Nucleic acid binder design. Structure first.
Ligand SMILES: [Mg+2]
Ligand SMILES: [Mg+2]
Ligand SMILES: [Mg+2]
Ligand SMILES: [Mg+2]
Ligand SMILES: [Mg+2]
Ligand SMILES: [Mg+2]
Ligand SMILES: [Mg+2]
Ligand SMILES: [Mg+2]
Ligand SMILES: [Mg+2]
Ligand SMILES: [Mg+2]
Ligand SMILES: [Mg+2]
Ligand SMILES: [Mg+2]
Lengths: 95, 95, 243, 49, 63, 110
RNA sequence: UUAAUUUAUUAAUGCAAACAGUAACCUGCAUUAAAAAUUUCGGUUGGGGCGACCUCGGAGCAGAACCCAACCUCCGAGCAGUACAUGCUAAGACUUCACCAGUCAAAGCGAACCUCAAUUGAUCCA
RNA sequence: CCGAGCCUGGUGAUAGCUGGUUGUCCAAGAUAGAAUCUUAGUUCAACUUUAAAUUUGCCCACAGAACCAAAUCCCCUU
RNA sequence: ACCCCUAUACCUUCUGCAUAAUGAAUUAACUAGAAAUAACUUUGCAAGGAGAGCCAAAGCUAAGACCCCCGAAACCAGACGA
RNA sequence: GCUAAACCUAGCCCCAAACCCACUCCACCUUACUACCAGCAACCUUAGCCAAACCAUUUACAUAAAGUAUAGGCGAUA
């Protein structure tokens, strides 16, 4: 994904009006890319003990690739949704 | 100088003039002397002094400036404490 | 001469006029909505007023979206809100340097997605942005449901959504027997959403498709006039008997 | 100017002189577009008031 | 009692009803007021006229 | 527009004075404006040319003109140079004599 | 094209992004190439070319208030040196035949007790 | 009619260049210089026209305008 | 009626054209100055004017009155042709 | 006296109002106007003339606020 700042300034047109645009408003200047960004980490609840990377029942911050192409498809983990979190807590308590 | 604009069909102002000059209500045009913020070392003090004064434009120049602007820049403006306010109106003329 | 209504309104008029009027009220509403989609390729001016530089003065600040271009590859599989950007660049980002045209493409992929409501694995063209969105909404199904039609950005996605809605409505067996409890559980996950069965049929359709559907619905065979005549005769006879 | 107005009947000094009253009288014409911020009282008829 | 202005008496094309104007100006007004619901073949012509007119006024003549 | 209140002593401050009753019998009469001022005005035709105008004149304009001439001849050392227009009861007198003219009018009692 | 500005196209690379593991194919940003693409080709001139010149000053033509040309005749300049009140301001003038640029300058307030012929360059931008 | 086809559209393209600009009668009315990719043009000045306001305008007579011819400037009277 | 005397077509372009410089066989009909600021003018009202907004140290409202035609080689977009 | 002249009314222009058109039969996407036999499919910024007296960034495509704020080789102009 590319974020593209618009050079040349759209001249500001009303509440309920489209602002017509010019072939110089078509000129852009890319401010940032979503790529070339600090890689973030995703939260997952583990349904199974995995190696040293996760303890069963616990909520861990994983590398996103690992989450998306291994853990989630293989039923080894689930998203940090508030829904199932409660359930997991309950399970822990029971244990 | 756009005697008729595209959308409104009114005359436009050449904004260079507006940037550079001050129209007194009497229709004198006041200008900062050129070459006044430049190469001041080589210039003799008297010359510097001369260059730091404001100046009144020639009749022809004034006329040109009037043509170049719209009637808005020629209105009476009642500023609170503009330093030039006293020069707008003219006193004790005789031909 | 002059036209009665302007040319931008002709399409609207057309809807009123014929077969498009026979389409239901809840469907045409969707067509008419056309809201502002989620910003993807530009940072928005979140506040309506900013106070600019150069002069210490507040002024209004509207945010005009970058037009975007979706090539027909993107209709086949879920891309995000993002599609191809078509624009121009100044050469070394000085305006006094040359202006030259530019096409900015999204980074495409090909990935599988299991959908609980559908019980099937869909290979999808999926941008990173889409993946991120999915993660945010947790389930792919959830994302499909949650994502507003303008936001979703694909015909395929829309279709999927429609299917999901239908499933929710009917309460049809996706897991077949030996998993009724499981099915119930799944359903309970998505008690939110779940529109009436008649509305969910029309969801995520083009105009032409909708029209076709409508036609199919009210095609039939023409009824014999003879039958009608006979009925009338019978009625008359009955009336006579009564009197 | 104010004095003149008073003399002429328009602008009643038994009431308060608010901007509105002045406007009604038609002593001071003012215009919000072109950024007028109201009347300013001036010294011009200081004596003979 | 000033219920109606004399400019509301006049019957004519909507774009110039109580509005004097100029050649170019009139064209512009037409384009804005009516152009939306104007015949393709004529709208184009109008646009062309406007283009020409601007050039003629803003550039071509004397003084 | 309201008719101005009856003050205690004329001429009022800001040098106003009403048109005195009864009307002074003369060949000419000068109505006042909307605002009850005596209608003599400055005018500058060109950049140079400066003049005064008495414009509400009624009846015998010629007589009025003559009177004006008589009045103003000792100041200038001339015959003032006047363009009367009979149709619209007016009087273009060359050079400003506005305030003086007004004063004269007041004295006369218009 | 070895004139300028560009590389959006193709070129490989390089760095990201995607990837896998263990003790390639695509997108984004950089790179230099190839290929191209916009583009312009100043004036004076005893035709044009070639050669020379193109701004400023002094002398002659121009003998006595200014002004006065030529690819007319002759010298030169594109700096120095001394200061560091080469501080502030200000009546009134001159002016390179316009404008812009230049010049002179009484008084006053502050202080003491400029030389030099030419010696320079607008606006916007930095 | 290929140094890059033809047609339509943008296109009433653009021309400091050339050509052309149609009833009567009267009046005033001529080329000091500037800069300028500028000398086939331009914009200031100068001259020219009109409408104003005005007081001086032209002709000019003695005096006067360094040193290293013809004349001119200034100039009261007239 | 000729014969006598006087008499260098026109337009354009020119420092200057009878020029042997351009154009024009002739008739007919068609064929080329259109825009406001700012001025001036005469009305209207007037320390105000104006049918909101705008202008106003005599103004403001009003009308009237100035600003051509023909002509490239060209450039680009989209069709059509071996 | 020949050639010729002359001649109103076809219709048309600009508004206003109102949202139009489209199967007697047969034929017509194959070489259209053809009675009768086994495989594709649409979407992808406009540019340039031109103006800037060259030319490269750049140049418009109800009323009032307002040709105001802003933009701009800070200029043309928008
Ligand atoms: Mg609005
Ligand atoms: Mg040459
Ligand atoms: Mg030679
Ligand atoms: Mg001079
Ligand atoms: Mg001194
Ligand atoms: Mg032409
Ligand atoms: Mg004459
Ligand atoms: Mg010739
Ligand atoms: Mg060209
Ligand atoms: Mg062949
Ligand atoms: Mg150009
Ligand atoms: Mg050229």
């Amino acid at each position: 994904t590319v974020i593209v700042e618009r050079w040349w300034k759209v001249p500001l047109a009303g509440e309920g009006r489209k602002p017509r645009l010019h072939r110089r408003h078509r000129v852009y200047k890319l401010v940032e890319d979503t790529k070339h960004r600090p890689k973030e980490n995703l939260e997952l609840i583990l349904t199974q003990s995995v190696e040293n990377v996760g303890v069963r029942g616990d909520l861990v911050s994983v590398k996103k690739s690992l989450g998306r192409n291994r853990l989630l498809p293989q039923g080894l983990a689930v998203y940090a949704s508030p829904e199932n979190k409660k359930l997991f807590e309950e399970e822990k308590l029971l244990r | 100088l756009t005697y008729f604009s595209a959308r409104k069909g009114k005359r436009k102002t050449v904004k260079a003039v507006i940037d550079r000059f001050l129209r007194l209500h009497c229709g004198l045009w006041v200008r900062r002397k050129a070459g006044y913020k430049k190469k001041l070392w080589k210039k003799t003090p008297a010359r510097k002094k001369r260059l730091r004064e404001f100046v009144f434009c020639n009749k022809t120049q004034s006329k040109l400036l009037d043509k170049m602007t719209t009637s808005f820049w020629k209105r009476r403006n009642w500023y609170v404490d503009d330093p030039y306010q006293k020069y707008h109106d003219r006193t004790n003329l005789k031909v | 001469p002059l036209h009665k209504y302007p040319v931008w309104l002709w399409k609207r008029l057309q809807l009123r006029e014929g077969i498009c009027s026979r389409l239901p009220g809840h469907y045409l509403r969707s067509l008419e909505e056309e809201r502002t989609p989620t910003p993807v390729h530009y940072r928005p001016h979140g506040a309506k007023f900013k106070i600019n530089p150069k002069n210490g003065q507040r002024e209004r600040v509207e945010d005009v979206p970058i037009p975007i271009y979706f090539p027909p590859e993107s209709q086949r599989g879920l891309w995000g809100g993002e599609g191809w950007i078509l624009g121009q660049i100044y050469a070394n980002n000085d305006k006094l340097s040359k202006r030259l045209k530019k096409v900015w493409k999204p980074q495409l992929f090909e990935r599988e997605f299991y959908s609980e409501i559908l019980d099937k694995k869909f290979t999808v063209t999926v941008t990173m942005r889409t993946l991120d969105l999915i993660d945010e909404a947790y389930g792919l199904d959830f994302y499909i449901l949650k994502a507003s039609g303008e936001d979703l950005c694909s015909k395929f996605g829309m279709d999927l959504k429609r299917g999901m809605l239908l499933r929710l409505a009917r309460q049809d067996p996706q897991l077949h027997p030996e998993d009724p409890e499981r099915r119930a559980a799944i359903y309970d996950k998505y008690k939110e959403f779940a529109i009436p069965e008649e509305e969910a049929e029309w969801v995520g359709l083009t105009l032409e498709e909708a029209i076709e559907k409508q036609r199919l619905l009210e095609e039939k065979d023409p009824v014999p006039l003879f039958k009608i005549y006979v009925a009338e005769l019978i009625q008359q006879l009955q009336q006579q008997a009564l009197s | 100017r104010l004095q003149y107005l008073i003399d002429l009947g328009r602008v009643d000094p038994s009431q308060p002189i608010d901007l509105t009253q002045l406007v009604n009288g038609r002593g001071v014409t003012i215009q919000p577009l072109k950024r007028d911020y109201g009347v300013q009282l001036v010294e011009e008829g200081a004596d003979t008031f | 009692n000033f219920e109606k202005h004399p400019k509301e008496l006049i019957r004519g094309p909507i774009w110039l009803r109580g509005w004097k104007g100029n050649e170019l100006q009139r064209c512009i007004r037409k384009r804005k007021m009516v152009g939306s619901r104007m015949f393709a073949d004529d709208l184009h012509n109008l646009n062309k006229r406007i283009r020409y007119l601007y050039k003629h006024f803003n550039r071509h003549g004397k003084f | 527009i309201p008719d101005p209140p009856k003050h205690e002593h004329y001429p009022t401050p800001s040098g106003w004075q009403p048109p005195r009753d009864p009307p002074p019998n003369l060949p000419y009469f000068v109505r006042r404006s909307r605002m009850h001022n005596i209608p003599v005005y400055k005018d500058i035709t060109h950049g140079n040319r400066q003049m005064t105008v008495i414009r509400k004149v009624e009846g015998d304009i010629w007589a009025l003109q003559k009177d004006v001439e008589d009045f103003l001849s000792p100041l200038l050392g001339k015959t003032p140079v006047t363009q009367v227009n009979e149709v619209t009861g007016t009087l273009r007198i060359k050079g400003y004599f506005d305030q003086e003219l007004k004063a004269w009018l007041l004295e006369k009692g218009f």
